[PDB]
């Protein structure tokens with residue numbers, strides 16, 4: 001069974017310190033013997049500011065029981081730097097935490113602080129690890145934000161080569177081939193192609209990007225991710241809507257829709273109607289736009305009846 | 317009042333079309349559609365005059381939810397150790413839910429809430445997730461603790477507000493230690509940087525009269541650059557080397573869109589030149605309304621494009637709608653009404669899908685098939701309140717507030733960390749106090765705008781947009797720290 005720390009030779013010099021939330025606290029938690037004992041000794045360790053191997057072991061015991069315990073993670077990182085511990089060994093521990101489903105904001109931030117301090121001259125191994133880690137949840141928000149940070153931080157240091165950017169777009173394209181409805185991967189494409197400071201903006205790149213967007217819509221006409229990317233693309237680069245209308249009009253009844261539309265594609269597509277209405281507004285045909293908003297409000301997108309009525313009224 | 321808010325039971329329910337292209341997203345979407353629509357099919361339409369025979373009654377089961385929350389005042393099972401660094405959130409979720417449900421705590425229990433939270437306050441500044449001899453201060457429990465003291469505290473010697481007033485300088489110093497040059501904040505020493513920290517910090521700084529120019533520098537730019545091409549906001553923005561540019565770091569999410577809209581709204585009160593940097597309010601309103609689910613998924617909100625509806629986004633996304641609406645109204649005004657989301661369908665999701673099944677533990681939940689918890693209880697009810705009561709920010713109310721403000725009353729001015737970090741003179745500092753106080757008290761419930769789906773026994777109390785506490789708590793709390801009456 002469990003051996004209390006009070007009976008351990010290695011901890012005999014330490015007087016534990018009890019949790020102090022008063023005599024009758026609200027929201028008290030019925031702690032296990034193991035958790036209370038470890039926190040009792042952590043309070044004493046932190047009070048004397050001991051930076052030691054036994055303190056390092058103790059912090060690992062605690063965060064395995066509560067991975068969201070930010071105070072103990074903060075102490076752990078200061079132990080790693082004060083004792084000049086192998087940060088590569090700690091990264092392998094964070095890989096194990098992910099496998100064992102020990103996860104939180106705090107573990108992800110600990111990983112970020114490790115990469116920042118290691119400061120690898122080439123982060124390719126970490127990039128490839130993060131890619132593989134998406135297998136159990138390809139939309140993990142922490143993972144996508146971390147990947148953005150990793151490329152942004154190390155590109156500021158000049159350490160992302162053109163070959164590395166190119167294989168990242170290849171990987172992104174494959175993610176969207178496997179699931180074109182993964183909005184996280186659409187967001188990543190936007191970073192790679194539009195928002196990152198090193199992205200190319202030329203007449204060719206704009207043409208390539210529009211082709212990719214329109215092909216994606218024709219593959220999955222009801223995919224909201226593809227429609228939002230199209231609207232953001234046109235707005236960001238101040239591109240008119242009317243010249244592209246031929247590719248959109250078949251959904252309101254450069255790449256064009258399939259001559260027979262794919263099966264299970266009921267018409268009209270509401271975001272295609274929004275495109276048409278906004279196109280009328282671009283042409284200053286406010287009454288035509290108002291009629292499309294009115295049909296969205298009363299017929300085709302009735303969950304948003306009030307929003308589309310708001311847009312209709314704005315036409316006057 | 318409901319011409320443009322159709323009931324889910326009055327619309328044709330149909331699955332999201334596949335376009336003959338299967339994917340993992342669609343597999344999980346279709347499974348969730350079946351789960352929600354089946355429960356609606358077993359439940360009597362809340363809008364019917366006499367409830368159908370053999371179907372479940374959807375009335376809000378307030379007494380079950382009250383008993384669900386009662387364990388907070390005795391003890392929580394060992395599985396709650398995963399929230400041991402968030403005990404002020406357990407307090408907030410409980411005491412704000414009871415406020416919304418109209419259940420009063422007795423004074424002895426309120427005094428225990430106050431005393432527990434004051435043991436989480438560090439002398440060097442801020443609240444931690446637990447006792448100060450155990451946890452370091454953190455921006456998120458600092459918001460939850462301050463809001464919980466607004467709900468449970470008072471101005472007496474045992475009411476906690478006096479202790480908060482004495483801690484103003486130390487809390488300010490904690491906030492300045494968290495501040496990054498680009499406008500972000502760490503949530504704690506060595507902690508992560510995102511708009512959750514900005515939101516929690518700005519709420520507390522607004523309520524306690526500790527806003528300074530040095531605290532706010534670049535905070536508007538950090539938040540503005542979190543807005544994505546979809547119109548919502550990501551967790552954070554990255555400054556490339558004051559910076560040459562800033563880039564958003566992930567996709568738009570309801571949680572971070574709530575924090576960003578609310579942070580930006582609080583900054584619009586601050587009289588600094590060319591401040592705050594604007595956001596695209598039209599795009600944010602569009603993103604907000606597009607997250608409301610279809611009739612087959614009960615009209616609840618999802619947190620991001622192509623993921624699933626979840627009751628807690630009734631607050632995070634629904635509660636951002638009045639803020640986005642007001643920002644849109646201001647922009648139309650500068651250049652020179654029907655509900656903006658389906659207020660009826662959101663209530664139907666809450667009543668039909670988000671309540672624990674009757675005769676059970678009580679509590680509200682993410683979706684059918686998920687256990688209820690205190691976090692989903694608080695956020696389902698907060699969003700239900702926004703749907704029931706039409707909230708707006710009233711310029712005439714702000715004008716009346718300006719007219720009654722007494723700039724000669726107040727607590728001692730914060731001493732800035734840097735010599736030139738304060739307001740220029742008393743005229744400017746008092747103008748800032750007046751604007752920030754008067755706008756914080758500018759939210760009203762619109763006369764005649766109430767919509768209580770299922771009848772008046774389902775009505776809960778009115779929460780405030782941006783702060784998410786009742787107005788009857790917000791007003792005496794902020795009046796205490798600004799010495800108004």
Ligand SMILES: CCCC[C@H]1CN(c2cccc(OC(F)(F)F)c2)C(=O)CN1Cc1cncn1Cc1ccc(C#N)c(F)c1
Nearest residue numbers: 105399402405456512571619626628629682689690691692
């Ligand atoms: C009772 C368990 C709730 C878990 C929930 C909330 N929770 C959290 C914890 C502490 C403070 C806190 O603060 C505030 F947010 F104010 F409540 C929030 C989590 O960590 C993860 N959650 C899982 C989630 C359930 N439904 C949607 N999600 C997604 C999600 C992810 C991260 C955050 C954060 N931050 C979040 F809020 C929701």
Ligand SMILES: CC(C)=CCC/C(C)=C/CC/C(C)=C/COP(=O)(O)OP(=O)(O)O
Nearest residue numbers: 141142512571572575619620623624626632
């Ligand atoms: C004041 C404060 C702390 C506000 C934060 C509120 C909030 C809801 C934040 C969400 C952050 C996040 C990473 C969600 C993804 O979780 P998920 O993948 O489990 O859920 P999803 O599928 O719904 O996106």
Ligand SMILES: O=S(=O)(O)C[C@H](O)CNC1CCCCC1
Nearest residue numbers: 376377378379380381382674675
């Ligand atoms: O559903 S709720 O309104 O929260 C409360 C429960 O239904 C309590 N039901 C009681 C059962 C025995 C008769 C008296 C009422």
Ligand SMILES: O=S(=O)(O)C[C@H](O)CNC1CCCCC1
Nearest residue numbers: 046438439440448449450451452
């Ligand atoms: O005087 S203050 O600095 O305000 C308060 C104490 O220092 C708090 N120190 C704790 C020790 C154990 C770990 C968590 C913090």
Ligand SMILES: O=S(=O)(O)C[C@H](O)CNC1CCCCC1
Nearest residue numbers: 373375768770771772773774775
């Ligand atoms: O005030 S009104 O909206 O006209 C009608 C009441 O609220 C109806 N509430 C029900 C009464 C019977 C028990 C279950 C609740």
Ligand SMILES: [Zn+2]
Nearest residue numbers: 626627628682
């Ligand atoms: Zn949820």
